[PDB]
Amino acid sequence: RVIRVGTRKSQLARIQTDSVVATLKASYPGLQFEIIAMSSLFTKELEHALEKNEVDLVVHSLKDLPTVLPPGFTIGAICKRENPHDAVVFHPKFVGKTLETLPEKSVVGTSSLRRAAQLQRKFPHLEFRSIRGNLNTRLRKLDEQQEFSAIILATAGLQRMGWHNRVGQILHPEECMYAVGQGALGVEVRAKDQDILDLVGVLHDPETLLRCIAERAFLRHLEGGCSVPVAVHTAMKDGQLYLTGGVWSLDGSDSIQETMQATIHVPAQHEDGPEDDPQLVGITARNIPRGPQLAAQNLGISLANLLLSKGAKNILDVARQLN
Ligand SMILES: *Cc1[nH]c(Cc2[nH]c(Cc3[nH]c(Cc4[nH]cc(CCC(=O)O)c4CC(=O)O)c(CCC(=O)O)c3CC(=O)O)c(CCC(=O)O)c2CC(=O)O)c(CCC(=O)O)c1CC(=O)O
């Protein structure tokens, strides 16, 4: 069998897929890999090819995969996270500036409700208006017109394009927490395909795996739906897993944010895990110890429950109906 890899045509999707194939080819230099390019939600188009056996794995940005995947598919590999933080690209005239030092009423472009909500609260002296198009078009709207003084986007996308040099400012968590699963890639496969699941299991990075299980379990337990201001921050230091999560009204004046930790050790050994284990928030990692995997899910759930008892659902409901 030749391992067929499906991908979207867009530039960033192509670049992400190529980097995943490169990592698989380092582990499996003796196998052939073909990359098949194909044509508000694009995932189900790739998912249709995956179930009908026209491709065998699809590479996604993990934050584009909902917390509930269709029952026949699973995330079989959580690759090592790149830089997860949000970044600012400034207008050529504003080189050397920050969001704080931009003149008042400078327009900042972003179509992310999560970014607009957090940044309108942290920088009330700036307008945040929607910016439309792909990364290449957004950078041309920034350069050619004088509508936008800056645009907001994810660092990882700029880096994968090789455009690190256009990054003016990296936003820290206290300014802007990143989206659930941002900076990590997810390999999505048929749920009952033992062979592909075993092959891509080599891509699993234990720390990104556990960190993303907490972020996705936290996100799913709030049941806020699609396109709502939820942001997270994870870190593992000293055998502890830290999960900070927050919810905001669309405009940023309403916010609940809390942090909780748990003792969860990062596993270094691989194991031959059971074949009938259920997926955790759509993730199958049979070669990583499941104990820490469940504890990470338990951490996300506990923090979501804490936020909910402090009024998180009503913020999510106003934000949803105001979108
Ligand atoms: C109900 C529901 N649907 C989904 C899937 C889903 N996730 C998002 C978040 C998202 N995606 C993008 C575009 C993007 N994807 C990757 C990159 C590069 C960086 C990387 O690889 O991580 C980008 C561009 C970039 O971030 O710079 C955005 C940005 C939109 C913008 O800038 O204009 C976002 C929003 C954000 O980051 O805060 C979406 C939204 C797509 C959009 O254009 O708004 C969707 C589909 C949808 O909302 O309908 C999820 C998973 C969300 C998650 O895990 O983070 C859910 C939640 C659930 O299942 O309950």
- Pair (62, 113) in one structural domain: no
Task: Give every CB contact of residue 204 below 8 A, 6+ residues apart in sequence.
Answer: 77, 78, 79, 285, 287, 288
Alpha-carbon 292 to chain mean position:
21
Quote the CA–CA distance of 76 and 230 in Å, as a whole number.
25
Quote the CA–CA distance of 194 and 203 in Å, as a whole number.
15
- Pair (74, 223) in one structural domain: no
Per the CB < 8 A criterion, the answer to whether 295 and 214 are in contact is: no
Closest CA to 74 of 194, 168, 240: 194
Closest CA to 74 of 284, 297, 274: 284
Distance 63 CA to ligand 1 centre (A): 5
Quote the CA–CA distance of 178 and 230 in Å, as a whole number.
9
**Is the C-alpha dihedral spanning 266, 270, 271, 275 positive or negative?**
positive
Number of domains in the chain: 3
Which residue has a Cα nearest atom 39 of ligand 1?
64
Place of tokens 């050994």: 269
- Pair (71, 191) in one structural domain: yes
Which residue has a Cα nearest atom 7 of ligand 1?
64
- Pair (241, 198) in one structural domain: no
Residues in the chain: 323
Strands of the sheet with 255-263, listed across from one edge: 230-237, 240-248, 255-263
Alpha-carbon 111 to chain mean position:
16
Q: How was this structure determined?
A: X-ray
Closest CA to 241 of 270, 269, 266: 266
Ligand 1, residues at Cβ distance < 6 Å: 40, 61, 63-64, 66-68, 110-112, 114-115, 153-154, 156-157, 179-183, 219-220, 225-227
- Mutate which of 10, 45, 62, 64 for ligand 1? The one with the most ligand atoms within 8 Å of its CB, which is 64
Domain span at residue 72 reads 1-79+184-204
Closest CA to 85 of 172, 201, 159: 172
- Pair (211, 323) in one structural domain: yes
Distance 1 CA to ligand 1 centre (A): 34
Quote the CA–CA distance of 97 and 81 in Å, as a whole number.
28
